[PDB]
Structure formats: C-alpha cells, structure tokens
Amino acid sequence: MKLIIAGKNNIAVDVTKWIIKTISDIELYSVCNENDHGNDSFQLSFKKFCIQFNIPIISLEDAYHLEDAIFLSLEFDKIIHPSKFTHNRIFNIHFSYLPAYKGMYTSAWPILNNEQESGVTLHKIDHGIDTGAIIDQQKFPLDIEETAKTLYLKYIKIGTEIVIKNLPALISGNYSIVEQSAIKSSYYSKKSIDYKNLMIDLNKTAHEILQQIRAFTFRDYQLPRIDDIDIFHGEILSSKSLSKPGTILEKNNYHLILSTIDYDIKLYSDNFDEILTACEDKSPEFISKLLKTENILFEKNHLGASPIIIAAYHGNMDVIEWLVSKGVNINDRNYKGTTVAMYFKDYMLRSGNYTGLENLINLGLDLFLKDNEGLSVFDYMRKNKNIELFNFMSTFN
Amino acid sequence: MKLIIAGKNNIAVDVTKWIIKTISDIELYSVCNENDHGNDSFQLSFKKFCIQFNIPIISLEDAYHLEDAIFLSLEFDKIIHPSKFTHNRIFNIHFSYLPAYKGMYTSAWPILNNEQESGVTLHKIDHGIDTGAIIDQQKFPLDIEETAKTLYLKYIKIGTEIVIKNLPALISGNYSIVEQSAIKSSYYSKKSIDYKNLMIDLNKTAHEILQQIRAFTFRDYQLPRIDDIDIFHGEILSSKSLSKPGTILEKNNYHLILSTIDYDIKLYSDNFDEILTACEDKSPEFISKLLKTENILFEKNHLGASPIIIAAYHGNMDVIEWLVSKGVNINDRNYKGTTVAMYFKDYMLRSGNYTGLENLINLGLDLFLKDNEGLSVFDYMRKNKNIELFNFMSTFN
Ligand SMILES: Cc1cn([C@H]2C[C@H](O)[C@@H](COP(=O)(O)OP(=O)(O)O[C@H]3O[C@H](C)[C@@H](O)[C@H](N)[C@H]3O)O2)c(=O)[nH]c1=O
Ligand SMILES: Cc1cn([C@H]2C[C@H](O)[C@@H](COP(=O)(O)OP(=O)(O)O[C@H]3O[C@H](C)[C@@H](O)[C@H](N)[C@H]3O)O2)c(=O)[nH]c1=O
Ligand SMILES: Nc1nc(=O)c2c([nH]1)NC[C@@H](CNc1ccc(C(=O)N[C@@H](CCC(=O)O)C(=O)O)cc1)N2C=O
Ligand SMILES: Nc1nc(=O)c2c([nH]1)NC[C@@H](CNc1ccc(C(=O)N[C@@H](CCC(=O)O)C(=O)O)cc1)N2C=O
Ligand SMILES: [Cl-]
Ligand SMILES: [Cl-]
Ligand SMILES: [Cl-]
Ligand SMILES: [Cl-]
Ligand SMILES: [Cl-]
Ligand SMILES: [Cl-]
Ligand SMILES: [K+]
Ligand SMILES: [K+]
Ligand code: NA
Ligand code: NA
Ligand code: NA
Ligand code: NA
Ligand code: NA
Ligand code: NA
Ligand code: NA
Ligand code: NA
C-alpha cells in the first residue's frame, strides 16, 4: 500500500519520520509545496528531508494516477479535487477546530476574535475549502499572551500528534466520520489580512489593540510596527487619556504609550537583539531589567539562536541557570537541531573550562540528542579529535 | 430638584412618562437630538412629545448651566463632557452589556459576531465613548433569527425598564458604581458599517452570510439586497454546490439560491406588500403558503400597519384568529398608537356586521387602550356620534 504525504514543515517531516519508524510495509511518496525550495527555516524543508531520506518526490498530477494509495495533506498549498482520484482515501489536517476557521491565517484570526480556545482537525478532503467530514479533532486553550507564532507551533505539535494517533485507522479504513455542521462554521480568505501592509486599528479599545498586536506577532514573518517602532508585546495601563485614540502620549527607545478608546496602552519596543548580546556576558540581574516582557526570553533569531543558546556558547553559567528557572528548555535547539549541549561543548573546548558541565547535567542537559544531520555531540568530538573533552563528557550518566 | 432628559425615541418618551406619573416633585427639562424634527416614525418623536406635554426643551449648552440637576442621556446624539457641569450626576443608558460593544451599531455587531447574548447598561458619563463606571446592567439571549430591528426593540424595552428601576437611586444618590474592566472591552465606530453602501460578503459560509443578512434586516431603514432583490430572511440548505461562493444557482420571484463556502443558502425575497394585501380578504391557508418565513407575520409598514391591523380593518376574522394563534398581539398598534380594536370598530361601522367582536374579546381584545392622542375607541365613537355601535361595544366586560 502506498502513502502519499503532500505538504510542508515539521508536521510533514515528523509524520513522515513516524511512518518510517513504525510502518515499514508502506511505500512512501512526497508531494511538496511550490514555495518549498529546499531551505530550512523556523520549520524544516520537507523537500530537503525527502531527498535526504530517499522518499520519492512526485507531482500532484502523478499522485492522481497512483492506485492503491492513501493521500494525506499537511499544510499543502494546492487545491485537491476528490474527483481526480480512483479512491476516497484522501485526508487533511486543518489548523482549527472545524467547522470554525476554515481557510486562511488560522494562527491570527482566533486571536483577533478573542477566542478562548482553538484546535486541530483531521478530516476528509472534499471539493471545497476545509469542508469535508471530520475524522478526529482536539482542542486547547489560548494563553493570555498567545501570539500567532506560539499558536502556530501548538498547531504543528497537536496536528502531528493527531495524525500519528489516527494513521493506523486511516490505513485500515476503520475510522468514523461526521459531517461538519453549518452552525458556527466560519471562513477567512487570503484577502482578510494584508500581511504586506498590515495596519493596526488604533481607534479601538486597549484590549482590541493588544489582541491585534499579539495576532500579528510572528518574528520569522513580522513584528507589528507602530510609528516606525517594531513592537514586542505590551500592557494595558490604568490611566485613561482624553486625547483621540491613537495619540502618542510618550515615545522613547523603550516603548510607546498610546491613548485608546478606554485605557492607555504601553507597547514595548522589540529589544531582542540587545537581549541576545547581553546573554554573552551579562548577569541575570542585568538581563531582568533590560527585558520588558519575559516572552523575549523564548524568542529565536532567523537561525534559531535563543537567549539560552547564546549563554551556553559563551559559558554564561548564571544566565543559563536563570533561564532554566524561568522555564526555558535546557535542551533548546536552533533550526538545524544543534542543541544547548553542543554549544556548551564549544565553550568548554574554546576556554578549557570544564567545571560547569556537571551543574547543567543536574539541571537536565541531555548529551545524547542528535541534530538534523543525525549527529550527537560525541560524533562531533570524535570527528574533530577532541578526545580529552569527549572522555570528560562521557563520565556523566 | 431638576431632571434633564437628553435623547430620543420611546425610551426617552416612556421614561419621561413614568417620571410624570410617579415623581411629581421634579422639574423636567428636555434636550433633543439634531435629527428629531418632530415626526413620529417606528419610534415617537421626543420633541413632539415634550412640546405636547409642556416639558421645556433646552439646548445642551443650557443644560451645562443648570445647577441642582441630574442629567440622563437616552440615545442622545452629542458628546457630553463631565467637566462642563457643576456636578457629577450625569448618567447614560447604552445599548450593550458593557464593556463589550461600546460605540455604534450595537443592534448589528452582536449579530454579525454571532453572540449568544446582549444587554443594556446604565453607567456614569465620562469624557470618552461609553467608558464610565457601571451602575446597573441586564443581559438577555439573542434569538436564533434575531435581526437588528428585533434586537433594537429589546434594547428600547430593557433600557426603559432599567432606567425606571434605578431612577429613585439616581435621584437619592444612593447607588453603587464599578469601573469597567479593560478585558473583553470592544468598540465599533461609525466607519465600521456603511449603511449607504452595504455589501454582504458572499465569499463566506452559509451561517456567516445569514448572520449578515439578519444583522442588516431593519425594515424601517433597509433590507439587505442581493442581485437586485430585497431579502427577508433565508435558510441553510443541505446541498453543497461546487461553484464559486456567491454563484447564483437559482433566481425567481420567490428566492435566490447561492453557493457558499459550505452549504447552499436560500434567501427569501421580501413579499411583505403581498402579505398585507392578502390579509384584506384571503384565507389563513392562502397566507400560509404565500409567506416564506413566519417572521413576515410580525412586520410593519412605515405607518405601523401589520398583518393583523389589515385583517382587522377588513374584518377578516379567520386571519385575525390565525395570526393570534401564531403569537401575534391581538392588541397591536400602529405608530400613532391606533389599536386593533379601533381598526375592527371601523370595519363594524362600515359593514354593519357586529357579530365578530365577541370572539375577539374572548381572545383578549382590549377596548380600553388609548392611542398617542390619549383617546380610546369610545372617545372616537362618541365624537363621531356612532352611539348604537358605542353602546354595543360597551356591553363587553
Ligand atoms: C504569510 C504570513 C503568515 N503569518 C501567520 C498567520 C498564519 O496562520 C501562520 C502560518 O502561515 P502560513 O503557513 O503561510 O499560512 P496559513 O496559516 O494561512 O495556512 C493556509 O495556507 C496553507 C498552505 C494551507 O495548507 C493551510 N491549511 C491554510 O490555513 O503565520 C504571519 O504572521 N505573517 C505572514 O506574512
Ligand atoms: C443608521 C442605521 C442603523 N441601523 C441599525 C443599527 C443600529 O444599532 C440601530 C439603531 O440605529 P440608530 O439609533 O441610528 O444608531 P446606533 O444604534 O448606532 O446608536 C448610536 O448612536 C446614537 C445616537 C447613540 O446615542 C447610541 N448610544 C449609539 O450606539 O439600527 C440600520 O439597520 N440602518 C441604518 O441605516
Ligand atoms: N479541496 C481542497 N480544499 C482545501 O481547503 C485545501 C486543499 N484542497 N488542498 C490543500 C490546501 C489548499 N488551499 C488553497 C486555498 C486557496 C487557493 C487559491 O488559489 N485561492 C484563490 C482565492 C484566494 C483566497 O480567497 O484565499 C486564489 O486566487 O489564490 C489555493 C489553495 N487546502 C487546505 O489547506
Ligand atoms: N462623553 C460621551 N460619550 C458618549 O459615548 C456619548 C455621549 N457623551 N453623549 C451621547 C452619545 C454621543 N455619541 C457620539 C459619538 C460620536 C460622535 C462623533 O462626532 N464622532 C466622530 C467620529 C465618528 C465615529 O467614529 O463614530 C464624528 O466625526 O462623527 C458624536 C457623538 N454618547 C453615547 O451614546
Ligand atoms: Cl506554502
Ligand atoms: Cl568538537
Ligand atoms: Cl584531545
Ligand atoms: Cl439621532
Ligand atoms: Cl367612530
Ligand atoms: Cl348611532
Ligand atoms: K483615551
Ligand atoms: K459552495
Ligand atoms: Na522551511
Ligand atoms: Na472519527
Ligand atoms: Na493576505
Ligand atoms: Na523588566
Ligand atoms: Na421618530
Ligand atoms: Na450599582
Ligand atoms: Na457608517
Ligand atoms: Na410557507
């Protein structure tokens, strides 16, 4: 039996990995998105992965002709018409709790509309947009400071889990379906948000504006920009200016304060670059006063470098420990899968200071992770003939 | 103590009536809206009422200078600045459950946003838009086929009741306040809907389109118009056309059927004029097949004439009884307060057929209501020297 995975990003990669691991009786095929040109970013290129793992890449037109197959879309970019296949084993993951939020921008709209929850849905593909019957779905709450990025990452994670949970049933044909209700069905088109001329409506309440701010916060794509300042989170003040909504009450390097329909708002300028630099050699005290929101402690640059990665590469031990205490992952990775341990190893090698490792191991540092090339820190130390450091690191269980 | 009532419509009229009835120790003043030019419509002119009841009409500028006063806005049209008064006894009724739906078009927005409920709020006036502290509020559910008109009428009714309930406390100064929360505060401006170029977004789900249809249904102002057809309600079909959303699948004198993102919709053309004509002399059977929604049975023309009024004026007895059985008010009135009984009297007079009255009295017909001029059916029969009919009608308790 053939399984065609059509789509992109870590959902398509991780689903495909689980299949390779778990279901060896299956002949796998890939259909990729037009904009996937082989470059990893915040999400892995499914194209690059398939080529490296010897998964044959086929066109959509080819997939139509494959008989004895299941077809599974995961953030795929082309409309699929059920009529064009010999069979009805055509499945999709959509990033909403259907029937709500059919269509586009499902990491923004629920936030813009102040939903309490969202979810992910596995359903049949039918001819229309996210209209087909439901096989399974899972819901989750939206956090108070949820952004489009944090939301999208929850969708990737939950979607991957729902596919793996259901795939044996999709394969066996032993699943149930329920037609989507018309009631509380909703849809947004690509015209509904112009990401290339995004404007925040300031003639609104504090809460409405901060909803918009957070819905448009997705660092890899954009930050919201107000009065020529990139914004990273904000807060609602207790003051209530009489000035027209949108009036700039205060503007400095740190923030803007605006009048709204109700309560004044304070919008924090983005200082992520400054946070990264500070993590090289400054104290947790210093950093705690530089940041305006603790959200900034979990941000990543275009390579995936985070505060804790920088701290680790520079052997800034007090900052590593402090970040961990704020809930940062001691085993964080950049976008190539390089781990905190690998960066810390670099510091040990460069400095000759091995004394900090034990502390990190006790805080949960995992030496046995593999990066996107399938190599561990040990594989690198061996390749580079850093045998003394290898052997030192090897003493930790 | 002085009480200034600033505003419009039946809220301002009915509140003022209760004051006249209940609180004779009070010196009343009126401030009217710029667009109130003395003409009754679906709502009474507050200007006309004040002139007839010898309530002095003053300017807003005059109201600022009145000391020892309370000021109460009821759908008033001009911004009131607390700074301009000697006192803080400045109160407003807003047609939403604040802090949600500050601003405009509160009979449409909750429907457009598929709210479960709305409400009315009595609050202090502060300098901004519907921002001041809450004194009281009441909530209610939205009906499944709620329209902007039905909603607005609930607001008028509930608002009037909340003012009367609270007015003794406003007068005594013995009320409590709570500041409005920032959370779930929302606002819409006059730019948010263009009633002079209203377009229904058809590239949406069946449910989204019917939400829009109903939010824009307010006969005195407009009906929604699609493909040059005025629409009065619709329904969601079980069919699901593949054609682009908004495609007209069928168009005839009765309805349009459109493709949507999900389920096809059927939008009923408005046939209210035909319903009114039918009520002159056609059977309930006939009328039941002419209507496409029972909502049409409760509609009124620009004078306030309804199906039951027409039936009564024409002595269409089977239609009167049938309408009552569908929940129509046997004591319905036009916009001048003329009642079903008054119209039925006209039929009796014209025809000489007195036989139907007893039936209507047993169904709840009230002979003792007064119109907007303060006259009953008896007052008219006496004035017109229709003594035989007067005396006949007088036998019913
Ligand atoms: C293009 C874009 C997107 N975003 C946000 C909002 C969006 O929900 C999230 C992920 O973006 P994406 O994967 O381009 O597009 P979207 O979520 O609309 O996904 C849609 O298109 C894809 C290809 C379909 O398979 C999917 N089912 C659709 O929902 O990132 C931004 O913040 N800025 C952007 O410029
Ligand atoms: C002008 C207009 C209104 N409507 C609907 C929607 C609106 O909520 C309802 C009553 O209209 P209205 O009283 O002009 O205006 P609105 O409800 O926006 O009230 C607003 O303005 C008045 C003067 C303020 O005191 C009030 N607090 C505001 O909410 O009728 C229509 O369907 N068509 C229209 O053309
Ligand atoms: N049948 C089907 N339904 C879907 O919802 C769907 C699939 N297939 N396949 C994968 C993905 C494809 N989604 C889309 C959505 C819109 C356009 C498109 O070309 N739209 C028009 C209109 C723009 C808009 O309103 O969004 C365009 O001109 O771009 C293409 C692919 N998708 C589910 O994820
Ligand atoms: N202080 C105060 N707040 C209010 O919300 C309020 C009052 N007073 N008095 C009665 C009524 C007045 N509402 C309004 C609202 C807007 C405009 C006005 O002129 N607005 C601008 C902007 C348009 C818009 O965005 O709606 C305009 O140019 O028309 C006037 C009166 N109103 C509460 O009912
Ligand atoms: Cl894409
Ligand atoms: Cl090494
Ligand atoms: Cl060595
Ligand atoms: Cl007005
Ligand atoms: Cl008479
Ligand atoms: Cl007589
Ligand atoms: K303000
Ligand atoms: K359709
Ligand atoms: Na990528
Ligand atoms: Na199922
Ligand atoms: Na767009
Ligand atoms: Na801080
Ligand atoms: Na009027
Ligand atoms: Na109170
Ligand atoms: Na408008
Ligand atoms: Na009918």
Side-chain angles (χ1 to χ4, degrees):
Chain A
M1 167 146 264
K2 295 174 191 91
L3 185 43
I4 308 156
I5 309 291
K8 71 168 165 176
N9 289 359
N10 292 0
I11 188 166
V13 173
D14 293 337
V15 167
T16 298
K17 291 177 170 190
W18 177 88
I19 293 167
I20 290 169
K21 180 179 180 193
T22 308
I23 322 225
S24 344
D25 263 49
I26 284 279
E27 198 175 311
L28 277 164
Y29 303 82
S30 173
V31 188
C32 294
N33 290 17
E34 196 196 286
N35 291 182
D36 181 352
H37 297 174
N39 292 300
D40 298 333
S41 68
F42 90 107
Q43 294 284 298
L44 289 180
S45 170
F46 190 45
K47 184 181 284 185
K48 190 169 101 87
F49 169 83
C50 287
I51 289 305
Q52 283 311 118
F53 288 73
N54 303 307
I55 300 152
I57 302 174
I58 64 169
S59 67
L60 180 62
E61 76 176 23
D62 293 339
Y64 298 146
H65 305 299
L66 289 172
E67 306 193 14
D68 298 329
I70 296 154
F71 182 104
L72 174 62
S73 173
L74 308 170
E75 298 301 286
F76 193 57
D77 62 339
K78 281 175 320 191
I79 296 287
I80 299 150
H81 291 132
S83 298
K84 298 170 173 165
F85 295 92
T86 55
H87 59 87
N88 87 151
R89 304 180 294 267
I90 60 188
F91 305 109
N92 180 244
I93 288 282
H94 179 68
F95 295 171
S96 76
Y97 204 78
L98 289 165
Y101 301 104
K102 295 172 172 56
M104 305 290 293
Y105 312 135
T106 69
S107 295
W109 276 113
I111 295 174
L112 293 160
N113 290 341
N114 195 219
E115 301 287 349
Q116 295 313 287
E117 294 174 309
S118 188
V120 181
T121 299
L122 176 67
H123 64 93
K124 300 295 312 290
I125 295 170
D126 72 2
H127 197 92
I129 302 296
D130 299 324
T131 49
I134 304 172
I135 297 168
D136 196 15
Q137 57 181 178
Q138 292 182 7
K139 61 171 85 156
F140 52 85
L142 302 183
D143 296 334
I144 181 158
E145 293 184 318
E146 196 82 67
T147 61
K149 179 163 181 176
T150 63
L151 180 51
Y152 186 75
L153 296 180
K154 291 183 180 181
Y155 286 148
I156 289 290
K157 179 173 186 286
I158 304 294
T160 302
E161 293 175 358
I162 213 168
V163 173
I164 288 169
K165 176 181 178 167
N166 289 266
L167 254 167
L170 300 186
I171 291 160
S172 74
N174 197 4
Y175 59 89
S176 59
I177 62 160
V178 63
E179 305 292 329
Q180 287 189 45
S181 177
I183 303 304
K184 288 151 87 106
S185 181
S186 62
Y187 165 80
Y188 293 93
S189 79
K190 57 110 197 269
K191 293 173 198 201
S192 69
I193 304 172
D194 188 357
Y195 281 103
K196 303 310 188 178
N197 187 29
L198 255 194
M199 291 152 329
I200 288 135
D201 184 0
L202 293 178
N203 186 28
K204 293 293 241 177
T205 72
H207 199 221
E208 286 171 318
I209 289 162
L210 280 176
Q211 285 164 210
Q212 298 171 74
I213 290 287
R214 290 191 283 260
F216 299 155
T217 297
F218 196 146
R219 185 176 295 272
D220 308 83
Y221 286 115
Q222 78 287 308
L223 297 178
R225 186 172 177 83
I226 289 187
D227 197 38
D228 302 313
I229 297 181
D230 287 352
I231 302 298
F232 192 74
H233 291 275
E235 59 180 283
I236 305 188
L237 300 181
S238 61
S239 51
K240 310 172 92 179
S241 175
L242 277 60
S243 65
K244 170 175 56 79
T247 296
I248 303 160
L249 306 174
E250 174 164 299
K251 175 174 186 184
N252 62 40
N253 293 155
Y254 306 130
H255 63 241
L256 291 179
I257 301 176
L258 293 186
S259 177
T260 81
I261 287 285
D262 58 9
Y263 290 92
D264 303 341
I265 62 173
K266 180 173 284 179
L267 298 180
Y268 315 132
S269 67
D270 178 39
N271 65 351
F272 180 62
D273 284 343
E274 294 84 348
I275 293 284
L276 291 180
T277 298
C279 286
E280 301 180 10
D281 59 4
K282 305 296 184 183
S283 70
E285 166 79 7
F286 181 102
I287 304 174
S288 78
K289 290 177 300 200
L290 177 54
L291 68 84
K292 294 163 282 185
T293 169
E294 291 183 355
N295 297 322
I296 212 161
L297 300 181
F298 301 81
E299 288 300 287
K300 283 184 182 285
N301 84 353
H302 66 114
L303 306 171
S306 55
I308 192 172
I309 287 170
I310 299 303
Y313 190 61
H314 291 264
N316 194 338
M317 284 284 323
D318 287 344
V319 173
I320 305 164
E321 291 179 338
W322 175 76
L323 290 174
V324 175
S325 83
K326 316 246 66 152
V328 174
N329 185 1
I330 200 163
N331 298 309
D332 199 20
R333 299 173 182 254
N334 85 345
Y335 293 158
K336 294 173 174 287
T338 311
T339 62
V340 170
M342 291 175 190
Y343 292 107
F344 197 69
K345 174 266 296 182
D346 285 338
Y347 164 74
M348 298 172 68
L349 183 61
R350 168 193 334 118
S351 77
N353 185 359
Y354 300 180
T355 64
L357 181 53
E358 189 159 30
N359 207 134
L360 300 186
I361 295 296
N362 292 339
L363 291 181
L365 191 72
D366 182 351
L367 303 184
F368 305 111
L369 298 175
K370 294 172 189 321
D371 66 14
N372 296 174
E373 293 289 310
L375 300 177
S376 78
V377 72
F378 293 101
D379 298 317
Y380 290 111
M381 295 182 290
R382 183 197 318 285
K383 187 193 64 159
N384 298 325
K385 299 188 181 189
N386 287 322
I387 305 309
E388 182 190 334
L389 183 49
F390 182 119
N391 287 342
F392 185 73
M393 295 191 80
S394 81
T395 64
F396 296 89
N397 45 88
Chain B
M1 167 146 264
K2 295 174 191 91
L3 185 43
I4 308 156
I5 309 291
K8 71 168 165 176
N9 289 359
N10 292 0
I11 188 166
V13 173
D14 293 337
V15 167
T16 298
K17 291 177 170 190
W18 177 88
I19 293 167
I20 290 169
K21 180 179 180 193
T22 308
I23 322 225
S24 344
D25 263 49
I26 284 279
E27 198 175 311
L28 277 164
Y29 303 82
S30 173
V31 188
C32 294
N33 290 17
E34 196 196 286
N35 291 182
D36 181 352
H37 297 174
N39 292 300
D40 298 333
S41 68
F42 90 107
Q43 294 284 298
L44 289 180
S45 170
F46 190 45
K47 184 181 284 185
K48 190 169 101 87
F49 169 83
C50 287
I51 289 305
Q52 283 311 118
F53 288 73
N54 303 307
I55 300 152
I57 302 174
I58 64 169
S59 67
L60 180 62
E61 76 176 23
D62 293 339
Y64 298 146
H65 305 299
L66 289 172
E67 306 193 14
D68 298 329
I70 296 154
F71 182 104
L72 174 62
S73 173
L74 308 170
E75 298 301 286
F76 193 57
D77 62 339
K78 281 175 320 191
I79 296 287
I80 299 150
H81 291 132
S83 298
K84 298 170 173 165
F85 295 92
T86 55
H87 59 87
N88 87 151
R89 304 180 294 267
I90 60 188
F91 305 109
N92 180 244
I93 288 282
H94 179 68
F95 295 171
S96 76
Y97 204 78
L98 289 165
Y101 301 104
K102 295 172 172 56
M104 305 290 293
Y105 312 135
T106 69
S107 295
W109 276 113
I111 295 174
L112 293 160
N113 290 341
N114 195 219
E115 301 287 349
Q116 295 313 287
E117 294 174 309
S118 188
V120 181
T121 299
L122 176 67
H123 64 93
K124 300 295 312 290
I125 295 170
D126 72 2
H127 197 92
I129 302 296
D130 299 324
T131 49
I134 304 172
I135 297 168
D136 196 15
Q137 57 181 178
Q138 292 182 7
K139 61 171 85 156
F140 52 85
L142 302 183
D143 296 334
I144 181 158
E145 293 184 318
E146 196 82 67
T147 61
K149 179 163 181 176
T150 63
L151 180 51
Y152 186 75
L153 296 180
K154 291 183 180 181
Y155 286 148
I156 289 290
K157 179 173 186 286
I158 304 294
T160 302
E161 293 175 358
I162 213 168
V163 173
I164 288 169
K165 176 181 178 167
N166 289 266
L167 254 167
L170 300 186
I171 291 160
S172 74
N174 197 4
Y175 59 89
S176 59
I177 62 160
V178 63
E179 305 292 329
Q180 287 189 45
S181 177
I183 303 304
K184 288 151 87 106
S185 181
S186 62
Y187 165 80
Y188 293 93
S189 79
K190 57 110 197 269
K191 293 173 198 201
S192 69
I193 304 172
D194 188 357
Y195 281 103
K196 303 310 188 178
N197 187 29
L198 255 194
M199 291 152 329
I200 288 135
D201 184 0
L202 293 178
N203 186 28
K204 293 293 241 177
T205 72
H207 199 221
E208 286 171 318
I209 289 162
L210 280 176
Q211 285 164 210
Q212 298 171 74
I213 290 287
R214 290 191 283 260
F216 299 155
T217 297
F218 196 146
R219 185 176 295 272
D220 308 83
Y221 286 115
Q222 78 287 308
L223 297 178
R225 186 172 177 83
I226 289 187
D227 197 38
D228 302 313
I229 297 181
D230 287 352
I231 302 298
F232 192 74
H233 291 275
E235 59 180 283
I236 305 188
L237 300 181
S238 61
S239 51
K240 310 172 92 179
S241 175
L242 277 60
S243 65
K244 170 175 56 79
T247 296
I248 303 160
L249 306 174
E250 174 164 299
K251 175 174 186 184
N252 62 40
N253 293 155
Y254 306 130
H255 63 241
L256 291 179
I257 301 176
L258 293 186
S259 177
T260 81
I261 287 285
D262 58 9
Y263 290 92
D264 303 341
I265 62 173
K266 180 173 284 179
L267 298 180
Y268 315 132
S269 67
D270 178 39
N271 65 351
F272 180 62
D273 284 343
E274 294 84 348
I275 293 284
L276 291 180
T277 298
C279 286
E280 301 180 10
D281 59 4
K282 305 296 184 183
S283 70
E285 166 79 7
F286 181 102
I287 304 174
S288 78
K289 290 177 300 200
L290 177 54
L291 68 84
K292 294 163 282 185
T293 169
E294 291 183 355
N295 297 322
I296 212 161
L297 300 181
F298 301 81
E299 288 300 287
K300 283 184 182 285
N301 84 353
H302 66 114
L303 306 171
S306 55
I308 192 172
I309 287 170
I310 299 303
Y313 190 61
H314 291 264
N316 194 338
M317 284 284 323
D318 287 344
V319 173
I320 305 164
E321 291 179 338
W322 175 76
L323 290 174
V324 175
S325 83
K326 316 246 66 152
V328 174
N329 185 1
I330 200 163
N331 298 309
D332 199 20
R333 299 173 182 254
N334 85 345
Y335 293 158
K336 294 173 174 287
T338 311
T339 62
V340 170
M342 291 175 190
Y343 292 107
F344 197 69
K345 174 266 296 182
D346 285 338
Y347 164 74
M348 298 172 68
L349 183 61
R350 168 193 334 118
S351 77
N353 185 359
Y354 300 180
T355 64
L357 181 53
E358 189 159 30
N359 207 134
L360 300 186
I361 295 296
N362 292 339
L363 291 181
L365 191 72
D366 182 351
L367 303 184
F368 305 111
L369 298 175
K370 294 172 189 321
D371 66 14
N372 296 174
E373 293 289 310
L375 300 177
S376 78
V377 72
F378 293 101
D379 298 317
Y380 290 111
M381 295 182 290
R382 183 197 318 285
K383 187 193 64 159
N384 298 325
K385 299 188 181 189
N386 287 322
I387 305 309
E388 182 190 334
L389 183 49
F390 182 119
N391 287 342
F392 185 73
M393 295 191 80
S394 81
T395 64
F396 296 89
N397 45 88

